[PDB]
């Protein structure tokens, strides 16, 4: 009989509130059975009970590591259902802050994974950069991580007069921090022994199991939603897609580092190409009017009243919209029935499929190998449990 | 367009083979990692001396809620109940009646700080700049009951933080 | 920063780079905490004359989905949902990392 052990919820490497029941022979892993739902808060029913604007805050919370990307995915879905279009400046701001969010998520994913592997120092070095990016978030929105900045009509407010310069100052120096991380991790033989040929998944199995994002790209599959199905302005920027060759943890780590570098490239392009204009769609029946017009114009006051009390109606219909969030393909299936409240809102998070495939991923490995495989999947349980 | 990340092979000339053997037997990359850590040791740490120093904030920062007044002393709130209708957490509870002088004013304005998500939608929805999210964030309490604000507590917050709230609004109202 | 020059040389040799060029700490190159007021342009539909709302109503141009092959109701070449995706090119910037 195999020994049965509980990994998590109150464990350092459980990554939050994950209960994993594992059958071990010795330290060999015979079967992993993830038990989730310890962070299931019934987000979708609550969304059913709110208006389209009131449900926006919930989206940041699904994945609390890359909050801005989640709002953008939701915003795109609502805009597609509304048959409207955000202004160019709003789209460029969206893509810039999406790249910043990707940087945040990758730093968190790489450092925590290293911390689980036992390399403590890299996490401390990069969380100062994460703090600076939180400063950017707070300056643009007023909240460090739960901005709710990206709205289903554009963005909420224009950038402060001295934000692009500070973003440039941070971006011109982030490369050396990435280089120090790579110096400490990439060529280390202990790191390679810990990550090479651990959690190898084949391309066909990765496709069938529903994997997306790096978990696809690490197996050699050339797929990226910003290149094949671009959404905001991603067809106007140039970047490269890192492709792995072995499908193990090491290849995915290298892919994430290269993704950080490419997102720095995209941030430079966004900084150089930011256009002038308005920040939300110039349609007062969808986006609220300016505070100056709400206090002088009768139509503006009526529209502000009806937008903040009832909310805008969305024509009936169903859509599935997916973006390339830092953790993979993040999608929403939104069903509207002509009301001001969504009828149904199903959230697709790549962590669901990745954690489902963890059991196949940890065949013939040790306990520490299972810790590494949990680290390499980039799992956050807010989006897994919803 | 794409690039490979782990698709390079090492040269097998005797010089490179001997260099790799020296790396294996003498731990060159481990010494490089030790050197990187040592270099970080001699830098100035990024730690601030809290509470004597504070992290930077912005005029748009959302903190503790407050209810404001007009320069004459009259309350700005008129009990339109827009903030209550827009609150995603249903944290605002409002009851109103005509005042003794006939004004449209609240008799109850309750905010549950433990239900609130500090999203700032309430100050967006308000048409008279009555309810705001102030700059304060150091208001931890020892009991749950102390985080259930009534109208008197919010008005006291406004009276206490108005000098800075007005300046913060003056620095950002042109972006709204 | 303010480190002693010998300590600076020690850091540069230990890390292998020139840390004085790029410092993680921000000293004086950030923007001022007080900025001039902005002006924030209006938008495309702020005209007074050629701006009837029924000509810019996105919500009212949405119509129910097209129904093809309702069950209740020759060459015929086979078709795909879309033309096959094209092969990606190998990054003239930096093909191999």
């Amino acid at each position: 009989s195999n020994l049965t052990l509980n990994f998590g919820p109150q464990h350092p490497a459980a990554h939050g509130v994950l209960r994993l029941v594992m059958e071990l022979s010795g330290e060999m892993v015979r079967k992993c059975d993830p038990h989730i739902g310890l962070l299931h808060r019934g987000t979708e029913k609550l969304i059913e009970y709110k208006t389209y604007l009131q449900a926006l805050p919930y989206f940041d919370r699904l994945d609390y590591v890359s909050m801005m990307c989640n709002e953008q995915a939701y915003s795109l879905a609502v805009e597609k259902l509304l048959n409207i279009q955000p202004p160019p400046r709003a789209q460029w701001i969206r893509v810039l802050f999406g790249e910043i969010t990707r940087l945040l998520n990758h730093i968190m994913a790489v450092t925590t994974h290293a911390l689980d592997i036992g390399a403590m120092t890299p996490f401390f070095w990069m969380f100062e950069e994460r703090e600076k990016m939180f400063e950017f978030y707070e300056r643009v929105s007023g909240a460090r991580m739960h901005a709710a900045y990206i709205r289903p009509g554009g963005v909420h407010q224009d950038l402060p007069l001295g934000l692009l310069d500070d973003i440039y100052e941070f971006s011109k120096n982030f490369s050396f921090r990435i280089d120090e991380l790579e110096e400490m991790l990439t060529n280390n033989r202990i790191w390679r022994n810990r990550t090479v040929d651990i959690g190898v998944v084949t391309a066909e199995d990765a496709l069938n199991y529903g994997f997306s994002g790096v978990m696809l790209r690490g197996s050699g599959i050339q797929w990226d939603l910003r290149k094949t199905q671009p959404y905001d302005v991603y067809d106007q920027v140039e970047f490269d897609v890192p492709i792995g060759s072995r499908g193990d943890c090491y290849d995915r780590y290298l892919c994430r580092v290269e993704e950080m570098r490419q997102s720095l490239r995209i941030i430079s392009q966004c900084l150089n190409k930011m256009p002038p204009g308005e920040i939300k769609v110039d349609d007062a029946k969808v986006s609220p009017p300016k505070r100056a017009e709400m206090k002088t114009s009768m139509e503006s006051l009526i529209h502000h009243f009806k937008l903040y009390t009832e909310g805008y109606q969305v024509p009936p219909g169903a859509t599935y919209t997916a973006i390339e969030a830092p953790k993979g393909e993040f999608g929403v299936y939104l069903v509207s029935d002509g009301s001001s409240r969504p009828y149904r809102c199903k959230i697709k998070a790549p962590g669901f499929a990745h954690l489902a495939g963890l059991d196949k991923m940890s065949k013939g490995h040790m306990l520490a190998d299972v810790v590494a495989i949990i680290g390499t999947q980039d799992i956050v349980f807010g989006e897994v449990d919803r | 367009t794409y690039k490979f990340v782990n698709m390079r092979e090492p040269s097998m000339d005797m010089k490179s083979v001997t260099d790799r053997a020296a790396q294996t037997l003498l731990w060159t990359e481990l010494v490089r990692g030790l050197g990187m850590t040592l270099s970080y040791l001699f830098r100035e740490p990024a730690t601030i001396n809290y509470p004597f120093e504070k992290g930077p904030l912005s005029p748009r920062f959302r903190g503790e809620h407050a209810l404001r007044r007009y320069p004459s002393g009259e309350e700005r709130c008129i009990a339109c109940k827009l903030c209550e209708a827009v609150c995603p957490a249903q944290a605002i509870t409002i009851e109103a009646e005509p005042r003794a002088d006939g004004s449209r004013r609240t008799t109850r304005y309750d905010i549950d700080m433990t239900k609130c998500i500090y999203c700032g939608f309430c100050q967006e929805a308000c048409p008279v700049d009555a309810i705001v999210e102030g700059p304060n964030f150091e208001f931890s309490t020892e009991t749950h009951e102390e985080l259930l604000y009534n109208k008197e507590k919010l008005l006291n917050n406004g009276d206490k933080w108005e000098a800075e709230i007005a300046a913060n609004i003056q620095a950002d109202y042109l972006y709204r | 920063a303010s480190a002693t020059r010998v300590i600076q040389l020690l850091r540069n040799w230990a890390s292998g780079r020139d840390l004085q060029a790029k410092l993680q700490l921000r000293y004086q190159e950030i923007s001022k905490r007080t900025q001039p007021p902005p002006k924030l342009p209006v938008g495309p539909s702020h005209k007074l004359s050629n701006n009837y709302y029924c000509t810019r109503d996105g919500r009212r141009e949405a119509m129910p989905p097209s129904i093809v092959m309702s069950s209740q109701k020759t060459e015929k070449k086979a078709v795909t949902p879309a033309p096959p995706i094209k092969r990606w090119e190998l990054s003239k910037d930096q093909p191999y990392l």
């Binding site: 490369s175 050396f176 930011m274 | - | -």
Partner: peptide, 29 residues
């Protein structure tokens, strides 16, 4: 009647941003 003031990049452009890996050799034979 004042001009429009907004957060924009400076005229011309921003300076180049380095992103490629920089790992020196720094060793003997």
């Amino acid at each position: 009647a004042s001009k429009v003031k907004q957060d924009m990049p400076p005229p011309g452009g921003y300076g180049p941003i380095d992103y490629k890996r920089n790992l020196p050799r720094r060793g003997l034979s």
